[PDB]
Amino acid sequence: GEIAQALKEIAKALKEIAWALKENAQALKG
Amino acid sequence: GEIAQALKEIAKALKEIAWALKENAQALKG
Amino acid sequence: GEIAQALKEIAKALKEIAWALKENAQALKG
Amino acid sequence: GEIAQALKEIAKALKEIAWALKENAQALKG
Amino acid sequence: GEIAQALKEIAKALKEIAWALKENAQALKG
Amino acid sequence: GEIAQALKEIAKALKEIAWALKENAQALKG
Amino acid sequence: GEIAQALKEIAKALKEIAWALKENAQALKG
Amino acid sequence: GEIAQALKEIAKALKEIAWALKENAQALKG
């Protein structure tokens, strides 16, 4: 269904936020 | 449907936050 | 509809968060 | 309706987070 | 209604996040 | 109801994030 | 119910974010 | 159900954000 699909897209976007925050951690290390 | 479309716009906005955080990581790396 | 409109306003606010985080990245650069 | 009104209050609160993050960018620029 | 009330409590909590981020900005200033 | 109760638990968790961010501001002030 | 349970899991995850932010505050102190 | 499953994926993504923030704390500690 379209609502579950859209919530799955929000989950994917939050995972992209996590990946970006890992990039910040690496930049501080470095 | 309009609710699914609005949730997809929230996902796009969260991807924009992810990209902004990537930009911060690049700024720290410099 | 009013719920979809309100979700669209949440998306716009998350885009404002992204813009603010870009301003942080620029301040670090710088 | 009260649910749409409450979602609009969440959007306003997210704009407040955006403004706080702008304040952080200004503090770093100084 | 209880759902609208609970969403209003989430809005209040996001405003508390904004206030905490302002405190961070002040600490950097500083 | 159980959905309202779960949304109230999300609000409490967001207040915990706010308090953690206050802690970060205090750490920067030191 | 499964939706309330899933919202409770989102609350637990936001509490984990709060704990991680406390770890950041401690690292700055340090 | 598919909505509960999608909300569980959002919770997992928020745990990924928590772990990324832990990584940032470790980077600052070094």
Side-chain angles (χ1 to χ4, degrees), chain A residues 1-7 9-11 13-14 16-28 30, chain B residues 1-4 6-30, chain C residues 1-7 9-11 13-14 16-28 30, chain D residues 1-4 6-30, chain E residues 1-7 9-11 13-14 16-28 30, chain F residues 1-4 6-30, chain G residues 1-7 9-11 13-14 16-28 30, chain H residues 1-4 6-30:
Chain A
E2 63 171 359
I3 300 295
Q5 296 336 109
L7 290 174
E9 291 301 315
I10 288 173
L14 291 170
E16 291 194 8
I17 291 176
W19 298 340
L21 289 168
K22 285 180 160 155
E23 287 189 34
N24 280 271
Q26 293 308 305
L28 289 168
Chain B
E2 63 171 357
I3 298 295
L7 291 170
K8 285 179 146 41
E9 291 189 13
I10 290 175
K12 288 183 181 96
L14 292 169
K15 287 184 186 275
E16 289 300 315
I17 291 174
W19 183 261
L21 292 166
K22 288 177 65 74
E23 286 206 359
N24 277 274
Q26 295 295 140
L28 288 173
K29 220 193 288 157
Chain C
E2 63 171 359
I3 300 295
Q5 296 336 109
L7 290 174
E9 291 301 315
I10 288 173
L14 291 170
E16 291 194 8
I17 291 176
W19 298 340
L21 289 168
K22 285 180 160 155
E23 287 189 34
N24 280 271
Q26 293 308 305
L28 289 168
Chain D
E2 63 171 357
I3 298 295
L7 291 170
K8 285 179 146 41
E9 291 189 13
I10 290 175
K12 288 183 181 96
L14 292 169
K15 287 184 186 275
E16 289 300 315
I17 291 174
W19 183 261
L21 292 166
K22 288 177 65 74
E23 286 206 359
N24 277 274
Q26 295 295 140
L28 288 173
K29 220 193 288 157
Chain E
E2 63 171 359
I3 300 295
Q5 296 336 109
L7 290 174
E9 291 301 315
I10 288 173
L14 291 170
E16 291 194 8
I17 291 176
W19 298 340
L21 289 168
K22 285 180 160 155
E23 287 189 34
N24 280 271
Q26 293 308 305
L28 289 168
Chain F
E2 63 171 357
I3 298 295
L7 291 170
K8 285 179 146 41
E9 291 189 13
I10 290 175
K12 288 183 181 96
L14 292 169
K15 287 184 186 275
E16 289 300 315
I17 291 174
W19 183 261
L21 292 166
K22 288 177 65 74
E23 286 206 359
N24 277 274
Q26 295 295 140
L28 288 173
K29 220 193 288 157
Chain G
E2 63 171 359
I3 300 295
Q5 296 336 109
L7 290 174
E9 291 301 315
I10 288 173
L14 291 170
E16 291 194 8
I17 291 176
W19 298 340
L21 289 168
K22 285 180 160 155
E23 287 189 34
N24 280 271
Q26 293 308 305
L28 289 168
Chain H
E2 63 171 357
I3 298 295
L7 291 170
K8 285 179 146 41
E9 291 189 13
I10 290 175
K12 288 183 181 96
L14 292 169
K15 287 184 186 275
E16 289 300 315
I17 291 174
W19 183 261
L21 292 166
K22 288 177 65 74
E23 286 206 359
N24 277 274
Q26 295 295 140
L28 288 173
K29 220 193 288 157

PDB file of all heavy atoms in Angstrom, chain B residues 2-22, unseen atoms left out:
ATOM      1  N   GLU B   2      -3.264  11.902  -1.462  1.00  0.00           N
ATOM      2  CA  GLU B   2      -2.645  13.136  -0.945  1.00  0.00           C
ATOM      3  C   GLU B   2      -1.884  12.867   0.367  1.00  0.00           C
ATOM      4  O   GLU B   2      -0.842  13.486   0.559  1.00  0.00           O
ATOM      5  CB  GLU B   2      -3.685  14.252  -0.760  1.00  0.00           C
ATOM      6  CG  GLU B   2      -4.760  13.975   0.249  1.00  0.00           C
ATOM      7  CD  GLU B   2      -5.680  15.130   0.603  1.00  0.00           C
ATOM      8  OE1 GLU B   2      -5.471  16.278   0.077  1.00  0.00           O
ATOM      9  OE2 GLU B   2      -6.576  14.887   1.432  1.00  0.00           O
ATOM     10  N   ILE B   3      -2.346  11.952   1.233  1.00  0.00           N
ATOM     11  CA  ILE B   3      -1.575  11.668   2.467  1.00  0.00           C
ATOM     12  C   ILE B   3      -0.261  10.989   2.072  1.00  0.00           C
ATOM     13  O   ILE B   3       0.768  11.414   2.582  1.00  0.00           O
ATOM     14  CB  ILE B   3      -2.398  10.826   3.443  1.00  0.00           C
ATOM     15  CG1 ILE B   3      -3.653  11.577   3.879  1.00  0.00           C
ATOM     16  CG2 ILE B   3      -1.531  10.423   4.622  1.00  0.00           C
ATOM     17  CD1 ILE B   3      -3.350  12.769   4.645  1.00  0.00           C
ATOM     18  N   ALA B   4      -0.302   9.942   1.232  1.00  0.00           N
ATOM     19  CA  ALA B   4       0.953   9.287   0.811  1.00  0.00           C
ATOM     20  C   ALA B   4       1.904  10.326   0.178  1.00  0.00           C
ATOM     21  O   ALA B   4       3.097  10.294   0.446  1.00  0.00           O
ATOM     22  CB  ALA B   4       0.677   8.132  -0.147  1.00  0.00           C
ATOM     23  N   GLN B   5       1.367  11.223  -0.663  1.00  0.00           N
ATOM     24  CA  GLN B   5       2.175  12.253  -1.369  1.00  0.00           C
ATOM     25  C   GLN B   5       2.844  13.153  -0.315  1.00  0.00           C
ATOM     26  O   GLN B   5       4.029  13.453  -0.450  1.00  0.00           O
ATOM     27  CB  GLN B   5       1.338  12.985  -2.418  1.00  0.00           C
ATOM     28  CG  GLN B   5       0.892  12.089  -3.575  1.00  0.00           C
ATOM     29  N   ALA B   6       2.113  13.531   0.734  1.00  0.00           N
ATOM     30  CA  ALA B   6       2.652  14.432   1.771  1.00  0.00           C
ATOM     31  C   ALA B   6       3.745  13.680   2.570  1.00  0.00           C
ATOM     32  O   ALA B   6       4.764  14.273   2.875  1.00  0.00           O
ATOM     33  CB  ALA B   6       1.547  14.874   2.624  1.00  0.00           C
ATOM     34  N   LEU B   7       3.542  12.368   2.831  1.00  0.00           N
ATOM     35  CA  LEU B   7       4.583  11.581   3.536  1.00  0.00           C
ATOM     36  C   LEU B   7       5.840  11.445   2.669  1.00  0.00           C
ATOM     37  O   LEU B   7       6.935  11.477   3.190  1.00  0.00           O
ATOM     38  CB  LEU B   7       4.028  10.216   3.901  1.00  0.00           C
ATOM     39  CG  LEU B   7       2.940  10.201   4.973  1.00  0.00           C
ATOM     40  CD1 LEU B   7       2.306   8.843   5.073  1.00  0.00           C
ATOM     41  CD2 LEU B   7       3.486  10.660   6.328  1.00  0.00           C
ATOM     42  N   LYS B   8       5.646  11.319   1.358  1.00  0.00           N
ATOM     43  CA  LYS B   8       6.789  11.295   0.411  1.00  0.00           C
ATOM     44  C   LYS B   8       7.540  12.639   0.440  1.00  0.00           C
ATOM     45  O   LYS B   8       8.768  12.637   0.370  1.00  0.00           O
ATOM     46  CB  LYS B   8       6.330  10.892  -0.978  1.00  0.00           C
ATOM     47  CG  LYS B   8       6.022   9.408  -1.162  1.00  0.00           C
ATOM     48  CD  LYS B   8       5.540   9.076  -2.592  1.00  0.00           C
ATOM     49  CE  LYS B   8       5.968   7.704  -3.101  1.00  0.00           C
ATOM     50  NZ  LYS B   8       5.859   6.637  -2.068  1.00  0.00           N
ATOM     51  N   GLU B   9       6.819  13.767   0.625  1.00  0.00           N
ATOM     52  CA  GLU B   9       7.472  15.092   0.728  1.00  0.00           C
ATOM     53  C   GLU B   9       8.270  15.142   2.047  1.00  0.00           C
ATOM     54  O   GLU B   9       9.332  15.759   2.073  1.00  0.00           O
ATOM     55  CB  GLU B   9       6.431  16.205   0.647  1.00  0.00           C
ATOM     56  CG  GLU B   9       5.785  16.361  -0.726  1.00  0.00           C
ATOM     57  CD  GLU B   9       4.887  17.572  -0.980  1.00  0.00           C
ATOM     58  OE1 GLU B   9       4.915  18.519  -0.120  1.00  0.00           O
ATOM     59  OE2 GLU B   9       4.149  17.584  -2.055  1.00  0.00           O
ATOM     60  N   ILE B  10       7.742  14.553   3.139  1.00  0.00           N
ATOM     61  CA  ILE B  10       8.519  14.464   4.394  1.00  0.00           C
ATOM     62  C   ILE B  10       9.801  13.636   4.176  1.00  0.00           C
ATOM     63  O   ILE B  10      10.868  14.028   4.613  1.00  0.00           O
ATOM     64  CB  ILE B  10       7.614  13.912   5.503  1.00  0.00           C
ATOM     65  CG1 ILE B  10       6.565  14.987   5.866  1.00  0.00           C
ATOM     66  CG2 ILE B  10       8.480  13.486   6.672  1.00  0.00           C
ATOM     67  CD1 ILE B  10       5.537  14.503   6.862  1.00  0.00           C
ATOM     68  N   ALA B  11       9.697  12.521   3.470  1.00  0.00           N
ATOM     69  CA  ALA B  11      10.907  11.736   3.189  1.00  0.00           C
ATOM     70  C   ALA B  11      11.921  12.577   2.396  1.00  0.00           C
ATOM     71  O   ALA B  11      13.087  12.532   2.704  1.00  0.00           O
ATOM     72  CB  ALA B  11      10.577  10.456   2.485  1.00  0.00           C
ATOM     73  N   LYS B  12      11.459  13.326   1.372  1.00  0.00           N
ATOM     74  CA  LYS B  12      12.380  14.157   0.572  1.00  0.00           C
ATOM     75  C   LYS B  12      13.066  15.190   1.489  1.00  0.00           C
ATOM     76  O   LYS B  12      14.244  15.480   1.314  1.00  0.00           O
ATOM     77  CB  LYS B  12      11.623  14.837  -0.566  1.00  0.00           C
ATOM     78  CG  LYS B  12      11.177  13.916  -1.704  1.00  0.00           C
ATOM     79  CD  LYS B  12      10.480  14.720  -2.828  1.00  0.00           C
ATOM     80  CE  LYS B  12       9.977  13.884  -3.985  1.00  0.00           C
ATOM     81  NZ  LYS B  12       8.540  13.535  -3.827  1.00  0.00           N
ATOM     82  N   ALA B  13      12.303  15.808   2.406  1.00  0.00           N
ATOM     83  CA  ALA B  13      12.850  16.795   3.338  1.00  0.00           C
ATOM     84  C   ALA B  13      13.890  16.145   4.272  1.00  0.00           C
ATOM     85  O   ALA B  13      14.943  16.776   4.535  1.00  0.00           O
ATOM     86  CB  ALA B  13      11.724  17.444   4.083  1.00  0.00           C
ATOM     87  N   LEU B  14      13.621  14.907   4.719  1.00  0.00           N
ATOM     88  CA  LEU B  14      14.628  14.212   5.538  1.00  0.00           C
ATOM     89  C   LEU B  14      15.898  13.913   4.715  1.00  0.00           C
ATOM     90  O   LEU B  14      16.990  14.073   5.252  1.00  0.00           O
ATOM     91  CB  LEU B  14      13.970  12.966   6.098  1.00  0.00           C
ATOM     92  CG  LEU B  14      12.873  13.214   7.136  1.00  0.00           C
ATOM     93  CD1 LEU B  14      12.127  11.911   7.389  1.00  0.00           C
ATOM     94  CD2 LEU B  14      13.454  13.819   8.416  1.00  0.00           C
ATOM     95  N   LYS B  15      15.767  13.610   3.423  1.00  0.00           N
ATOM     96  CA  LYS B  15      16.969  13.422   2.551  1.00  0.00           C
ATOM     97  C   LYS B  15      17.723  14.752   2.454  1.00  0.00           C
ATOM     98  O   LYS B  15      18.934  14.725   2.429  1.00  0.00           O
ATOM     99  CB  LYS B  15      16.565  12.902   1.175  1.00  0.00           C
ATOM    100  CG  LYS B  15      16.126  11.447   1.153  1.00  0.00           C
ATOM    101  CD  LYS B  15      15.838  10.998  -0.319  1.00  0.00           C
ATOM    102  CE  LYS B  15      15.263   9.614  -0.510  1.00  0.00           C
ATOM    103  NZ  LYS B  15      16.297   8.542  -0.554  1.00  0.00           N
ATOM    104  N   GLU B  16      16.995  15.896   2.458  1.00  0.00           N
ATOM    105  CA  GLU B  16      17.666  17.208   2.422  1.00  0.00           C
ATOM    106  C   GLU B  16      18.473  17.437   3.705  1.00  0.00           C
ATOM    107  O   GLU B  16      19.562  17.978   3.670  1.00  0.00           O
ATOM    108  CB  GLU B  16      16.662  18.327   2.193  1.00  0.00           C
ATOM    109  CG  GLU B  16      16.089  18.318   0.748  1.00  0.00           C
ATOM    110  CD  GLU B  16      17.110  18.475  -0.398  1.00  0.00           C
ATOM    111  OE1 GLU B  16      18.011  19.351  -0.300  1.00  0.00           O
ATOM    112  OE2 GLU B  16      17.016  17.714  -1.403  1.00  0.00           O
ATOM    113  N   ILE B  17      17.920  16.995   4.834  1.00  0.00           N
ATOM    114  CA  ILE B  17      18.657  17.077   6.109  1.00  0.00           C
ATOM    115  C   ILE B  17      19.919  16.203   6.024  1.00  0.00           C
ATOM    116  O   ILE B  17      20.961  16.664   6.405  1.00  0.00           O
ATOM    117  CB  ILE B  17      17.722  16.723   7.274  1.00  0.00           C
ATOM    118  CG1 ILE B  17      16.670  17.800   7.466  1.00  0.00           C
ATOM    119  CG2 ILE B  17      18.551  16.506   8.515  1.00  0.00           C
ATOM    120  CD1 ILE B  17      15.630  17.468   8.485  1.00  0.00           C
ATOM    121  N   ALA B  18      19.791  14.993   5.484  1.00  0.00           N
ATOM    122  CA  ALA B  18      20.949  14.103   5.312  1.00  0.00           C
ATOM    123  C   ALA B  18      22.027  14.798   4.480  1.00  0.00           C
ATOM    124  O   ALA B  18      23.189  14.829   4.876  1.00  0.00           O
ATOM    125  CB  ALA B  18      20.522  12.829   4.706  1.00  0.00           C
ATOM    126  N   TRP B  19      21.629  15.456   3.383  1.00  0.00           N
ATOM    127  CA  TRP B  19      22.607  16.099   2.496  1.00  0.00           C
ATOM    128  C   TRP B  19      23.280  17.269   3.203  1.00  0.00           C
ATOM    129  O   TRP B  19      24.480  17.445   3.044  1.00  0.00           O
ATOM    130  CB  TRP B  19      21.899  16.566   1.243  1.00  0.00           C
ATOM    131  CG  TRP B  19      22.841  17.174   0.271  1.00  0.00           C
ATOM    132  CD1 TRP B  19      23.095  18.498   0.057  1.00  0.00           C
ATOM    133  CD2 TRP B  19      23.793  16.440  -0.514  1.00  0.00           C
ATOM    134  NE1 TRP B  19      24.097  18.631  -0.872  1.00  0.00           N
ATOM    135  CE2 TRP B  19      24.556  17.382  -1.222  1.00  0.00           C
ATOM    136  CE3 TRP B  19      24.088  15.070  -0.648  1.00  0.00           C
ATOM    137  CZ2 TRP B  19      25.552  16.981  -2.110  1.00  0.00           C
ATOM    138  CZ3 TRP B  19      25.041  14.670  -1.553  1.00  0.00           C
ATOM    139  CH2 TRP B  19      25.770  15.623  -2.258  1.00  0.00           C
ATOM    140  N   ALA B  20      22.510  18.050   3.961  1.00  0.00           N
ATOM    141  CA  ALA B  20      23.074  19.145   4.773  1.00  0.00           C
ATOM    142  C   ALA B  20      24.110  18.607   5.764  1.00  0.00           C
ATOM    143  O   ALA B  20      25.128  19.255   5.939  1.00  0.00           O
ATOM    144  CB  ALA B  20      21.981  19.927   5.489  1.00  0.00           C
ATOM    145  N   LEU B  21      23.787  17.493   6.421  1.00  0.00           N
ATOM    146  CA  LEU B  21      24.762  16.865   7.351  1.00  0.00           C
ATOM    147  C   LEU B  21      26.008  16.358   6.620  1.00  0.00           C
ATOM    148  O   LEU B  21      27.119  16.525   7.189  1.00  0.00           O
ATOM    149  CB  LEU B  21      24.081  15.775   8.143  1.00  0.00           C
ATOM    150  CG  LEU B  21      23.035  16.258   9.125  1.00  0.00           C
ATOM    151  CD1 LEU B  21      22.196  15.057   9.599  1.00  0.00           C
ATOM    152  CD2 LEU B  21      23.661  17.025  10.300  1.00  0.00           C
ATOM    153  N   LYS B  22      25.874  15.895   5.364  1.00  0.00           N
ATOM    154  CA  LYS B  22      27.056  15.496   4.577  1.00  0.00           C
ATOM    155  C   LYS B  22      27.918  16.745   4.371  1.00  0.00           C
ATOM    156  O   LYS B  22      29.145  16.643   4.372  1.00  0.00           O
ATOM    157  CB  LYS B  22      26.638  14.831   3.265  1.00  0.00           C
ATOM    158  CG  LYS B  22      26.057  13.432   3.372  1.00  0.00           C
ATOM    159  CD  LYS B  22      25.592  12.868   1.996  1.00  0.00           C
ATOM    160  CE  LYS B  22      26.705  12.653   0.990  1.00  0.00           C
ATOM    161  NZ  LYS B  22      27.546  11.470   1.314  1.00  0.00           N
TER     162      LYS B  22
END
